[PDB]
């Protein structure tokens, strides 16, 4: 420990550990304070907590007649905290999450349009109203969107004979020409508009099995105003009966430039499927997380093992089994939503070098999290409170300024501002 070879001037015996004392040698607490030194002149300018912004978690005191403004709801408390941090000394604080009953929900429906979803397409014709009706049990303000995708329109993923370039399928099969991504409907609350417009889409097809929905997910994530995302909870339903292309597959096609994570819509068409590689899983993780997109993988039985693995790599996702005729999507969505919304997962931002976080969770039934699990609580039903013990240390004095890193539950725009101020100078 600090008992061995360690001796310097002033602001260095300070930043050496918890124990090391110096009377105005740098060895221990219960050894320097065990030997003759007056606890008057001894130096210890230790670290403090200081809660600055802290609106109370909204309780339901005003009863069932209060239809509460989304902007009044407060799920996470504190909101702005200043933490004064000394070296080696953790400065821990608790954070209270409470699940509100009612929050506006944007849901985008992104679907495979290759020929095996012809059956599926014909069921989705009526989905707009039946899903609006259902979702409204859960939310007072629901908006719906629809987008389609098939594939990259290049050798070798589609066949490029002039015939198949216009009808990628057989003689009888009336497939439209292949496309990458089409925004059929940006977010509306007119579920019937969904119904008409979805029933005007024509089914397509392509060559290789896995499709290019990853090109699509990215655009849906990053083309804010063109999709119509409001700063509410955002659901992307991604439904398909095939696997997925991802970064690296683009090489085969000559595409070698990695996806830029930028919007490239024109007349509601992704234009650059020729030019950019499919995004990597990591890339999506970034842009989805950063755009608060909770993903619902609605995939068929035969691709469960895969999309389950995908699900574990995408924070704030969920997976469920789609029937071949897509008859069961609504239940799927509901189920996916319920599990999504009944588990909170806490994420922080970029720390600076000599600064580390630790998490401890305390959920219902006395189930307590630790380590990576310190930031998860599940089984949270409406109104439930959970707490988090967030614990931050430091090694030595880096930036003699401050860091405004935010702690945030994934899916929610609600944040917790945490201001670090490092104590370096002598006293």
């Amino acid at each position, epitope marked *: 420990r600090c008992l061995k070879a360690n001796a310097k001037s002033c602001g260095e015996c300070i930043q050496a550990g918890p124990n090391c004392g110096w009377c105005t040698r740098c060895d221990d607490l219960e050894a320097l304070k065990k030997k003759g030194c007056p606890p008057d002149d001894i130096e210890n300018p230790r670290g403090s907590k200081d809660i600055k912004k802290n609106k109370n978690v909204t309780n339901r005191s005003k009863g*069932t*007649a209060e239809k509460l403004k989304p902007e009044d709801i407060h799920q996470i408390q504190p909101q702005q905290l200043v933490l004064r941090l000394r070296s080696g000394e953790p400065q821990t604080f608790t954070l209270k999450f409470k699940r509100a009953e009612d929050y506006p929900i944007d849901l985008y429906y992104l679907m495979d349009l290759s020929y095996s979803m012809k059956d599926d397409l014909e069921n989705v014709k009526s989905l707009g109203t039946d899903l609006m009706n259902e979702m409204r049990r859960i939310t007072s*303000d629901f908006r719906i969107g629809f987008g389609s995708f098939v594939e990259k329109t290049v050798m070798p993923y589609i066949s490029t004979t002039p015939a198949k370039l216009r009808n990628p399928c057989t003689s009888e099969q009336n497939c439209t020409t292949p496309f990458s991504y089409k925004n059929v409907l940006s977010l509306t609350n007119k579920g019937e508009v969904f119904n008409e417009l979805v029933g005007k889409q024509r089914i397509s097809g392509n060559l290789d099995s896995p499709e290019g929905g990853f090109d699509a997910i990215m655009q849906v994530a990053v083309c804010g105003s063109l999709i119509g995302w409001r700063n509410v909870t955002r659901l992307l339903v991604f439904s398909t009966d095939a696997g997925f292309h991802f970064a690296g597959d683009g090489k085969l096609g000559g595409i070698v430039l990695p996806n830029d994570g930028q919007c490239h819509l024109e007349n509601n068409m992704y234009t650059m499927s020729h030019y950019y590689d499919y995004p990597s899983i990591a890339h999506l993780v970034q842009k989805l997380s950063e755009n608060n997109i909770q993903t619902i993988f609605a995939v068929t039985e035969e691709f469960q093992p895969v999309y389950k693995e995908l699900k574990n790599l995408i924070p704030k996702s969920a997976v469920g089994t789609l029937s071949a005729n897509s008859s069961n999507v609504i239940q799927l969505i509901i189920d996916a939503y319920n599990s999504l919304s009944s588990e909170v997962i806490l994420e922080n931002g970029k720390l600076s070098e000599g600064v580390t976080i630790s998490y401890k969770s305390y959920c219902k039934n006395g189930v307590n999290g630790t380590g990576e699990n310190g930031r998860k609580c599940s089984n949270i039903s409406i109104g439930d409170e959970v707490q988090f013990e967030i614990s931050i240390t430091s090694n030595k004095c880096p930036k003699k300024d401050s860091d405004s890193f935010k702690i945030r539950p994934l899916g929610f725009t609600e944040e917790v501002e945490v201001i670090l101020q490092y104590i370096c100078e002598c006293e």
Partner: antibody
Amino acid sequence: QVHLQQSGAELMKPGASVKISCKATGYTFTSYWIEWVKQRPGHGLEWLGEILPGSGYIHYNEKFKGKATFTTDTSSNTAYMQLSSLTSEDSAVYYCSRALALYAMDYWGQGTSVTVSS
Amino acid sequence: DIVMTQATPSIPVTPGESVSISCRSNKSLLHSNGNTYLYWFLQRPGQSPRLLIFRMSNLASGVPDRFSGSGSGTAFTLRISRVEAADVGIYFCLQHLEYPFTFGAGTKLELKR
């Protein structure tokens, strides 16, 4: 399988007081208000009050202040209503149900008839 | 506070015909939400009330497409498309905006013969 099971039929004498129970299963008890409604044959339905199990939040219909008292037991997922100073006005069937601000009274109890006769 | 009027006490209807049932409110149930808070319940004889319509227009689960609800800000109607024997009962409206919550005295619905 969301279910509200209410206590059996009760025979009372004028001036007495009675406590009806409503046991909730199939959902987390502390997530929903329990709603209390009175039905007399000839006056239809009448909202009495609502209470939030975990809290101590009640909203009474003033007409019934000092007639109906609301309590819950979180450990046995049961809502209770107490009717006191029973008269012939209090003889009815009494329903508990369930509500959130956005979605009111989807599931109901089977009802409990309170008869006030000497 | 808020008064719900269901003027018609009962409506005899030949099975197969459609019916509108109306409810009025002395105050607009329209919230600043855009959500208007009127509910519809049906009580089959000797059974408890069942939710049919929530927030003016939306159907409760298990409720057939035959049932449809719409309305002004103060005048609302429930339309049943093909009245069966199972739709016989008392139809109550309910306001869920102001304490205390108020039902209209319901309208009974019976078969013509």
